[PDB]
Amino acid sequence: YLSNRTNSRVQSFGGVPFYPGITLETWQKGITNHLVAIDRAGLPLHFFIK
Amino acid sequence: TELALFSRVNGKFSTEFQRMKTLQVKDQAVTTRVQVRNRIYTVKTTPTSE
Ligand SMILES: *[C@@H]1O[C@H](CO)[C@@H](O)[C@H](O)[C@H]1NC(C)=O
Structure with missing residues (x-):
């Protein structure tokens, strides 16, 4: 009774x-x-509204 | 067997043979492949189109 998987x-x-x-x-x-972007980091966009 | 020299000389061989050869081979192969590919390369609509 042979069974590969x-x-x-x-x-x-x-x-x-x-x-x-x-x-x-x-x-x-x-x-x-x-x-491809394998890793990313940024800021909350409210920070950029200045 | 049998023999005699006075009243009872005979012969007998009630030979018998009974042979019964039975084979039963039973083979059952089963294969089952499944394989699936996927690719993506995404696309968005610009936030300012009309
Ligand atoms: C699969 O089964 C065969 C026998 O049919 C065996 O020789 C082998 O090692 C098993 N595995 C693979 C990956 O082929």
Whole structure:
């Protein structure tokens, strides 16, 4: 009684449209544009009304 | 078997054979793949359009 069970879940943001057979490299080299705000910080807008 | 030299000389072999070979192979493969892709690249309407 044999039973494989495989999962997989990539979750990328953001580079070149991901696909399973992609190397861990051609991802990187293809990051020239396709940049994404991974972290951000700002102020409450009432502060800017001066 | 049987023999005699006076009244009772005979022969007998009531040989018998009963064989019953039963096989029952039963194979059941089951495969089930599911795989789903998503991309986004969002778009907003400018706050001052007409
Ligand atoms: C899947 O089942 C096969 C046998 O059909 C086994 O050799 C293998 O290790 C299992 N796992 C993967 C990831 O193939």
